[PDB]
Motif scaffolding. Structure first.
Motif, short mmCIF file in Angstrom:
data_model
loop_
_atom_site.label_atom_id
_atom_site.label_comp_id
_atom_site.label_asym_id
_atom_site.label_seq_id
_atom_site.Cartn_x
_atom_site.Cartn_y
_atom_site.Cartn_z
N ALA A 90 -3.01 63.38 29.49
CA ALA A 90 -2.26 63.85 31.01
C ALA A 90 -1.02 63.39 30.93
O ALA A 90 -0.52 64.02 32.07
N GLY A 91 -0.44 62.58 30.19
CA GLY A 91 1.09 62.08 30.57
C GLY A 91 1.20 60.89 31.38
O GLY A 91 2.30 60.57 31.86
N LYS A 92 0.42 59.92 31.14
CA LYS A 92 0.68 58.64 31.66
C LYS A 92 2.00 57.63 31.31
O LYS A 92 2.65 57.46 32.03
N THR A 93 2.23 57.99 30.05
CA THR A 93 3.37 57.34 29.49
C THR A 93 4.61 58.00 29.55
O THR A 93 5.81 57.61 29.95
N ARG A 94 4.58 59.47 29.14
CA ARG A 94 5.99 60.20 29.15
C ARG A 94 6.16 60.81 30.52
O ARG A 94 7.60 61.16 30.60
N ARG A 95 5.28 60.80 31.43
CA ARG A 95 5.69 61.49 32.82
C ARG A 95 5.48 60.44 33.87
O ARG A 95 6.20 60.23 34.81
N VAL A 96 4.34 59.96 33.97
CA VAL A 96 3.99 58.87 35.29
C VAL A 96 4.70 57.73 35.24
O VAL A 96 5.65 57.17 35.93
N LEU A 97 4.77 56.78 33.75
CA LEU A 97 5.61 55.62 33.75
C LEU A 97 7.05 55.84 34.05
O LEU A 97 7.49 54.91 34.69
N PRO A 98 7.75 56.68 33.78
CA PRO A 98 9.34 56.63 33.89
C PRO A 98 9.49 56.78 35.51
O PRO A 98 10.43 56.06 35.97
N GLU A 99 8.80 57.65 36.34
CA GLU A 99 8.77 57.67 37.60
C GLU A 99 8.72 56.18 38.24
O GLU A 99 9.09 55.91 39.31
N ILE A 100 7.54 55.57 37.85
CA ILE A 100 7.24 54.19 38.22
C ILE A 100 8.36 53.37 38.19
O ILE A 100 8.91 52.74 39.05
N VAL A 101 9.16 53.34 36.91
CA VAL A 101 10.34 52.46 36.34
C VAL A 101 11.36 52.84 37.50
O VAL A 101 12.09 51.86 37.86
N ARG A 102 11.74 54.25 37.97
CA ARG A 102 12.56 54.44 38.71
C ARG A 102 12.35 53.97 40.13
O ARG A 102 13.31 53.13 40.60
N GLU A 103 11.45 54.11 40.58
CA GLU A 103 11.04 53.57 41.98
C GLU A 103 10.97 51.87 41.78
O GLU A 103 11.45 51.47 42.66
N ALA A 104 10.56 51.28 40.84
CA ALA A 104 10.55 49.77 40.75
C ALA A 104 11.96 49.54 40.68
O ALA A 104 12.50 48.31 41.56
N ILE A 105 12.80 49.98 40.01
CA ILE A 105 14.48 49.63 39.97
C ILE A 105 14.93 49.80 41.30
O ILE A 105 15.72 48.91 41.67
N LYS A 106 14.69 51.09 41.96
CA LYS A 106 15.19 51.08 43.25
C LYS A 106 14.69 50.35 44.24
O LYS A 106 15.59 49.87 45.13
N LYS A 107 13.75 49.60 44.32
CA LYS A 107 13.07 48.83 44.95
C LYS A 107 13.24 47.14 44.57
O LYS A 107 13.01 46.29 45.54
N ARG A 108 14.28 46.99 43.75
CA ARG A 108 14.21 45.71 43.32
C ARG A 108 13.23 44.81 42.77
O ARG A 108 13.08 43.83 43.56
N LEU A 109 12.35 45.44 42.09
CA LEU A 109 11.06 44.89 41.84
C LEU A 109 11.36 44.27 40.45
O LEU A 109 11.54 45.07 39.28
N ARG A 110 11.39 42.97 40.12
CA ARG A 110 11.18 42.32 38.84
C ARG A 110 9.98 42.91 37.90
O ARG A 110 8.96 42.69 38.52
N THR A 111 10.22 43.85 36.62
CA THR A 111 9.04 44.61 36.43
C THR A 111 8.59 44.15 34.81
O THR A 111 9.72 44.03 34.27
N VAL A 112 7.40 44.25 34.51
CA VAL A 112 7.12 43.96 33.26
C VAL A 112 6.28 45.06 33.02
O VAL A 112 5.33 45.49 33.45
N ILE A 113 6.66 45.79 31.56
CA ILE A 113 5.76 46.92 31.04
C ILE A 113 5.26 46.37 29.65
O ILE A 113 6.01 45.74 28.82
N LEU A 114 3.88 46.46 29.58
CA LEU A 114 3.27 45.92 28.57
C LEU A 114 2.58 47.12 27.59
O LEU A 114 1.77 47.45 28.04
N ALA A 115 3.06 46.87 26.38
CA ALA A 115 2.56 47.91 25.45
C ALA A 115 1.40 47.28 24.47
O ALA A 115 1.68 45.86 23.83
N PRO A 116 0.63 47.83 24.07
CA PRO A 116 -0.72 47.37 23.12
C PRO A 116 -0.12 47.37 21.75
O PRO A 116 -0.42 45.88 21.05
#
Ligand SMILES: CC(C)(C)c1ncc2c(n1)CCNC2
Length: 435
Positions: A16-42
């Motif tokens: 459905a596009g969780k990695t290529r479509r949803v994840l980049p939008e989440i990252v943009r919003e997190a950076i905009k809100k100054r949230l220290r973020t971790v992305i965990l890959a299997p």
């Protein structure tokens, strides 16, 4: 999702596009809100795929799978599930991430289960937000979820050994097939049988995963023979999945040994993930899924859940508090929180036996809790005769660090250290004091 005190499960169907479509939008919003973020890959392969989807965004790749110059301005870190858990275990401050995003949050390796438990506990305490991305969250009972294009599902008898006749449908196919086998040794047999019949075959497993996966994109192939590791975001340009619907299960017998039980049925999450490799291109309908058995809830009593509790018991959270397992998966093991808590010195040995020794969590715990230091290998040779490791039906032998030839006979026996030629070769080097 990004607001504190909350855990969200992003459960869109495979492809459905969780990695290529949803994840980049989440990252943009997190950076905009100054949230220290971790992305965990299997895996390192998924970390390389995530870099393509996030290319340009200020993300700090804490992995050697990506060759990127970090500017030092990043508030988003990307690392593997195992690296996150390893850093938590080691004497190193891990940032208290405001937002914790886990891709392929269904991964059942002990370090993934422990990362889920630590993150969900922080969320329960109201200290952080979390997003678990998976088509198959813990508890899923649907092995046939949605897809981008229709899939032909066919219940059929699937070979688990070499065959001379009775399975024409397997070789009478002109496309590309991904075949999920229960084990490395069973994969070697089917691969040899398909190779003898004129087929080009690539084999994948946890130990050979990054190197051999490259060959699927770099050369023409007829069959990919893989263990359950390819359920973790591995993508292929294929038109067919053959699924035995079977896996090996590590089981702790009487608290004294670990055996590899089965082959036994996979869970509905694993069946859905294996099927999910095809039906991903909306322009190519008719991809086939041939399955050879039913599903069962074989994660209950599986050794990875006990091993995850051994990891969490040795991770500092706050004073004497211990992280619980993520609620939907906490009943898969009967264990008291804190029962595997080791003292400082034995805990350091436990980590080093895992990190450097490459020993399974259960085996590392038995050695460390017994007060044995990392370099002390006497336990590899003083077990009972029934713990003798066999190689080609004859007792395996190694030259010890003392220059003496001894039979490999570990005090604690874990079938994962000799489940295949590569694992046994690595355990022989450990017993000899080579690492
Ligand atoms: C530190 C941690 C928990 C991420 C780890 N690292 C390496 C190994 C294992 N676990 C267990 C399986 N054997 C190698």
């Amino acid at each position: 999702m990004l607001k504190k005190k909350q855990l969200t499960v992003l459960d869109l169907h495979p492809g459905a596009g969780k990695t290529r479509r949803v994840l980049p939008e989440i990252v943009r919003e997190a950076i905009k809100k100054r949230l220290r973020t971790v992305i965990l890959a299997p895996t390192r392969v998924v970390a390389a795929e995530m870099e393509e989807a996030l290319r340009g965004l200020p993300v700090r790749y804490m992995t050697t799978a990506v060759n990127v110059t970090h500017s030092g301005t990043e508030i988003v870190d990307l690392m593997c599930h195992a690296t996150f858990t390893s850093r938590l275990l080691q004497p190193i401050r891990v940032p208290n991430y405001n937002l914790n995003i886990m891709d392929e949050a269904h991964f059942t390796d002990p370090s993934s289960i422990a990362a889920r438990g630590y993150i969900s506990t922080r969320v329960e305490m109201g200290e952080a937000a979390a997003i678990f991305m998976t088509a198959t969250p813990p508890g899923t009972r649907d092995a046939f979820p949605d897809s981008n294009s229709p899939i032909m599902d066919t219940e059929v008898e699937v070979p688990e050994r070499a065959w001379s006749s009775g399975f024409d449908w397997v070789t009478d196919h002109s496309g590309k097939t991904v075949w999920f086998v229960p084990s490395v040794r069973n994969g070697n047999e089917i691969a040899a049988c398909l190779t003898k019949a004129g087929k080009r075959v690539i084999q994948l497993s946890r130990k050979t995963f990054e190197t051999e996966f490259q060959k699927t994109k770099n050369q023409e192939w007829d069959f990919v023979i893989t263990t359950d590791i390819s359920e973790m975001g591995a993508n292929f340009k294929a038109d067919r999945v053959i699924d035995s619907r079977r896996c090996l299960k590590p089981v702790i017998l009487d608290g004294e040994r670990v055996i590899l039980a089965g082959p036994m049925p996979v869970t509905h999450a694993s069946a859905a993930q294996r099927r999910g490799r095809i039906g991903r291109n909306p322009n190519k309908p008719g991809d086939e899924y041939m399955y050879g058995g039913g599903c069962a809830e074989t994660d209950e009593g599986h050794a990875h859940w006990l091993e995850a509790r051994m990891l969490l018991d040795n991770i500092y959270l706050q004073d004497g508090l211990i992280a619980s397992l993520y609620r939907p998966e906490a009943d898969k093991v009967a264990a008291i929180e804190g029962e595997f808590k080791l003292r400082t010195e034995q805990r350091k040995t436990f980590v080093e036996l895992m990190k450097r020794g490459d020993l399974p969590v259960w085996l590392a715990y038995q050695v460390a809790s017994a007060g044995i230091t990392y370099t002390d290998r006497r336990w590899c040779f003083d077990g009972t005769t029934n713990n003798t490791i066999m190689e080609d039906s004859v007792p395996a032998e190694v030259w010890t660090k003392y220059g003496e030839k001894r039979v490999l006979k570990p005090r604690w026996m874990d079938a994962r250290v000799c489940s295949d030629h590569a694992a046994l070769k690595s355990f022989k080097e450990f017993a000899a004091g080579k690492r």
